[PDB]
Swiss-Prot record:
Effect of residue 89 to P: In OPTB3; in Czechoslovakia
Family, similarity comment: Belongs to the alpha-carbonic anhydrase family.
Impact noted for substituting residue 4 to F: Enhanced activity
Lineage summary: Eukaryota, Metazoa, Chordata, Craniata, Vertebrata
Outcome following mutation: residue 114 to Q: Strongly reduced activity and sulfonamide affinity
Effect noted on mutating residue 116 to D/N/Q: Reduced activity
Subunit organization: Interacts with SLC4A4. Interaction with SLC4A7 regulates SLC4A7 transporter activity. Interacts with SLC26A6 isoform 4 (via C-terminus cytoplasmic domain).
Protein's UniProt name: Carbonic anhydrase 2
pH dependence comment: Optimum pH is 6-8.
InterPro entries: CA_dom, CA_dom_sf, Carbonic_anhydrase_a-class, Carbonic_anhydrase_a-class_CS
Gene: CA2
Cofactor annotation comment: Zinc. Can also use cobalt(II) with lower efficiency, but not copper(II), nickel(II) and manganese(II).
Note: Target of drugs used in treatments against glaucoma disorder and breast cancer.
GO terms for cellular component: apical part of cell; cytoplasm; cytosol; extracellular exosome; myelin sheath; plasma membrane
Effect of residue 62 to S: 2-fold decrease in enzyme efficiency, as determined by kcat/KM ratio, and efficiently inhibited by chlorzolamide
Length: 257
């Protein structure tokens, strides 16, 4: 099955998932000089005051912080979006070293990591139906750089020891994702895809310009996770990022001057 190795990594995904070579794949390089300011874009509305996290999961590809999405509790609206999108999970992508890890790039710059907050359009009723629609998901992407620690991340880092290997989960209630957001909500937006199989072309991407800072210690704890299951040969969970894909016939729009 798919993964991030030599034999099963991004460059192989197209054989099981031919949409890998589609017209609206993610991530992409954001060329800041060609992304045009669009005065018609709105401020993003991120309303996470009632978010109810429940659990953290090592799925063998990353870890997922999961939310109760059975009511309108943590929603993304505005920005480029029409309608209301409910938070279902967040996860990250990161590198073996601080010089790579992000999926999106900015003028070819790779960040140490990238956070993805995944939301589904309530007009489709559930996540599985939403992913079948071109406007089914909105993913908020946030870059991570290594410097100062992010106090709001530390709760996540400290639970990772309990989900070292694939298929482990742990109760993870009361975690507030507002602690992961940067000061500015300036963003770039474009139409794209999931970045893991099945690579469905169902996402409005909203990538924040301002990175968050995390400490080397924090990211080092991400790199102690394992792709393998309990008691199998250890292969560290690192470099779980898809590289930039062809932009094709897309425009990247900026919310800011
Ligand atoms: O389980 C999976 O890898 C598919 C999946 C599910 C939810 C979000 C995703 N994304 O690319 O942001 C991908
Ligand atoms: Zn992701």
């Amino acid at each position: 099955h798919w993964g991030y190795g030599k034999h099963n990594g991004p460059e192989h995904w197209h054989k099981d998932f031919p949409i890998a070579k589609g017209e609206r794949q993610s991530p992409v390089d954001i060329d800041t000089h060609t992304a045009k300011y669009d005065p018609s874009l709105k401020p993003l509305s991120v309303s996470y005051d009632q978010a109810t996290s429940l659990r953290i999961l090592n799925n063998g590809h990353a870890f997922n912080v999961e939310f109760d999405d059975s009511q309108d509790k943590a929603v993304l609206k505005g920005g480029p979006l029409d309608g209301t999108y409910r938070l279902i999970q967040f996860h990250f992508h990161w590198g073996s070293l601080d010089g790579q890890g992000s999926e999106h790039t900015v003028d070819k710059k790779k960040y140490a990591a990238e956070l993805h907050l995944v939301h589904w359009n309530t007009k489709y009723g559930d996540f599985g139906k939403a992913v079948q629609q071109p406007d089914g998901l909105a993913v908020l992407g946030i870059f991570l750089k290594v410097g100062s620690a992010k106090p709001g991340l530390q709760k996540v880092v400290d639970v990772l020891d309990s989900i070292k290997t694939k298929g482990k989960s742990a109760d993870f209630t009361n975690f507030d994702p507002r602690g992961l957001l940067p000061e500015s909500l300036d963003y770039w937006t474009y139409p794209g895809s999931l970045t893991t199989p099945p690579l469905l072309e169902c996402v409005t991407w909203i990538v924040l310009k301002e990175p968050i800072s995390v400490s080397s210690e924090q990211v080092l704890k991400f790199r102690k996770l394992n792709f393998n299951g309990e008691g199998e040969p250890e292969e560290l969970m690192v470099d779980n990022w898809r590289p930039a894909q062809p932009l094709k016939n897309r425009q990247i729009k900026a919310s800011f001057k």
